């Protein structure tokens, strides 16, 4: 009966790591979508040119 | 110890020219064979003091409307 501890621990860690790897930490990748707007902030770097370069 | 007191509604020559004016009152203990110290506190509130006197006269030099005191006065 000791096989249920290693099989349940390895199966629970493999199923929890495979299922949680696409919903937990992978959810942080959704924050990278916000980075798609961060490039718009780079356009603000051109606004300062209106007070220097473009005058 | 002495301390040059300056309010927020004072002239721009004190905060913008604190280093050129503080040497006359702080150079008596440094250039005479004794120990001296200059506690230059609140720099961001002083280096920008020359900004309002630079952007109002139609003259751009530093970043975000600033003068040329970062490479000459330093």
């Amino acid at each position: 009966g000791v096989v249920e501890n290693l099989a349940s621990e390895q199966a629970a860690r493999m199923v929890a790591m495979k299922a949680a790897t696409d919903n937990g930490g992978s959810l942080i990748k959704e924050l990278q979508l916000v980075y798609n707007k961060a490039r718009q902030a780079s356009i603000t770097q051109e606004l300062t040119e209106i007070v220097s370069g473009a005058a | 110890t002495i301390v040059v007191v300056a309010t927020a509604s004072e002239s721009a020559a004190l905060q913008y020219l604190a280093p050129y004016a503080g040497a006359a009152m702080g150079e008596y203990f440094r250039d005479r064979g004794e120990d001296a110290l200059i506690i230059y506190d609140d720099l961001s509130k002083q280096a920008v003091a020359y900004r309002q006197i630079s952007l109002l006269l139609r003259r751009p030099p530093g970043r975000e409307a600033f003068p040329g005191d970062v490479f000459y006065l330093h």
Partner: protein, 466 residues
């Protein structure tokens, strides 16, 4: 490009760059589209006056160049503004950017010669009912109800290509509906014209389409001025009895030429590297392709976004100016199917809601719910095993695989190029067969005999005859 009547005007002044600051007449300036055919060098280089000024030196901008001119070039006055040659007889050869040709002779069929600046959007006599269209396919018409004379967007990568859309749309839409489907092109390659045009010899569309492309060797004003040929040449066939259907190439020429030319002229405009003329050209040009009483004006909205730029005008103008946007990924074409357009994210607002009927609502709800509910039983269950496969996995996998692999009916693109037939898929077979026999009824069709079948009409005899 204007009708000169008099040939007077005056001399010039400054000629630095592309700014045509020629001093023509004093108190006799022309219109906006009335260009002055100046004799700069040898040819008659015309310059469109974008903004008139007093004295004579007006802010004009030419298309090409002056080919070496002096400081005092003689100009000429015109009368008719934007007098180019077009008409409904342009379906026969490749067109240019000024109403002339690019392939053979004849100026792309010389016929009428009216105003090049056509009307944008109008009502009253125009069709305000906005009827639906039918392309005649099981994975284009049955999955997305397109409107008659609309600007449907496009997305995705490769898979279909120009040969499948041009060859499949140049025979089914041309015979199933009366009308001439033309094309355009702004910002293409110099070698593609020596290869893609060969496709016109493999589908017989050169005699029914006016290829108006500008390539990319010219500047912005000489290559981005292809809007007068499509609007001026497409209005002669759509307002006579036929239905015009243009096809754009990309948005890099109009966006780069419009933003760079409108923002690099010494004037401020929009932000994020954009210009202030995007709402007028996108809103006025996007609403011009509408249905009328004499014919529907359709146009293939093939705009290219700037790598999914939501802060710029590509996602807002492309997603807010067009209607339905179909996407074609590599998963539908990498397995070995005919149609590369997937059923996910490829529908309009009146194709899956309660604004059609029981056929479109039952077929869209059953195909969308069966595809979305069956797409996870073959991909997410492959990492574990097939031991827990009940009736939902076998029925959803067999119905989803057989319906997805058998719903791609072949059109007339491979009938004169590869050799496979199929004719055109009807709406009764795809709308009355994919909602009942593709869920849990008549499970006798396999995967090899169900391929290359016209909707669900040809798949019934293949299960017992093959």
């Amino acid at each position: 490009h204007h009708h000169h009547h008099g040939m007077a005007t005056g001399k010039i002044v400054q000629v630095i760059g592309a700014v045509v600051d020629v001093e023509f007449p004093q108190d006799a300036v022309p219109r906006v589209y009335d260009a002055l055919e100046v004799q700069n060098g040898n040819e008659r280089l015309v310059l469109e006056v974008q903004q008139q000024l007093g004295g004579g030196i007006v802010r004009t901008i030419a298309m090409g160049s002056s080919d070496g001119l002096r400081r005092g070039l003689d100009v000429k006055d015109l009368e008719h503004p934007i007098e180019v040659p077009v008409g409904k007889a342009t379906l026969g050869r490749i067109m240019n950017v000024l109403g002339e040709p690019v392939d053979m002779k004849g100026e792309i069929g010389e016929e009428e010669r009216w105003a090049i600046h056509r009307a944008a959007p109008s009502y009253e006599e125009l069709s305000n009912s906005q009827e639906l269209l039918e392309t005649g396919i099981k994975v284009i018409d049955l999955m997305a109800p397109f409107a008659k004379g609309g600007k449907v967007g496009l997305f995705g990568g490769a898979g279909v290509g120009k040969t499948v859309n041009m060859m499949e749309l140049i025979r089914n839409i041309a015979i199933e509906h009366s009308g001439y489907s033309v094309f355009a092109g702004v910002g293409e390659r110099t070698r593609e014209g020596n290869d893609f045009y060969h496709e016109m010899t493999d589908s017989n569309v050169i005699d029914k389409v006016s290829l108006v492309y500008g390539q990319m060797n010219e500047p912005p004003g000489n290559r981005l001025r292809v809007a007068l040929t499509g609007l001026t040449m497409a209005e002669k066939f759509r307002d006579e009895g036929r239905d015009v259907l243009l096809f754009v190439d990309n948005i890099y020429r109009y966006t780069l030429a419009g933003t760079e030319v409108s923002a690099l002229l010494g004037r401020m405009p929009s932000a994020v590297g954009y210009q202030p003329t995007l709402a007028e050209e996108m809103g006025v040009l996007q609403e011009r392709i509408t249905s009328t009483k004499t014919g529907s004006i359709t146009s293939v909205q093939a705009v290219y976004v700037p790598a999914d730029d939501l802060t710029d005008p590509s996602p807002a103008t492309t997603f807010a100016h067009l209607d339905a946007t179909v996407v074609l990924s590599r998963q539908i074409a990498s397995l070995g199917i005919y149609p590369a357009v997937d059923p996910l994210d490829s529908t309009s607002r009146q194709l899956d809601p309660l604004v059609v009927g029981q056929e479109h609502y039952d077929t869209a709800r059953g195909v969308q719910s069966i595809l979305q509910r069956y797409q996870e039983l073959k991909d997410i269950i492959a990492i574990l095993g097939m031991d827990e496969l009940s009736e939902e996995d076998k029925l959803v996998v067999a119905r989803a695989r057989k319906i997805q692999r058998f719903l791609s009916q072949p059109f007339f693109v491979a009938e004169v190029f590869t050799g496979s037939p199929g004719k055109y898929v009807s709406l009764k077979d795809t709308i009355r067969g994919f909602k009942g026999i593709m869920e849990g009824e008549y499970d006798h069709l396999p995967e090899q005999a169900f391929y290359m079948v016209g909707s669900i009409e040809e798949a019934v005899e293949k299960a017992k005859k093959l």
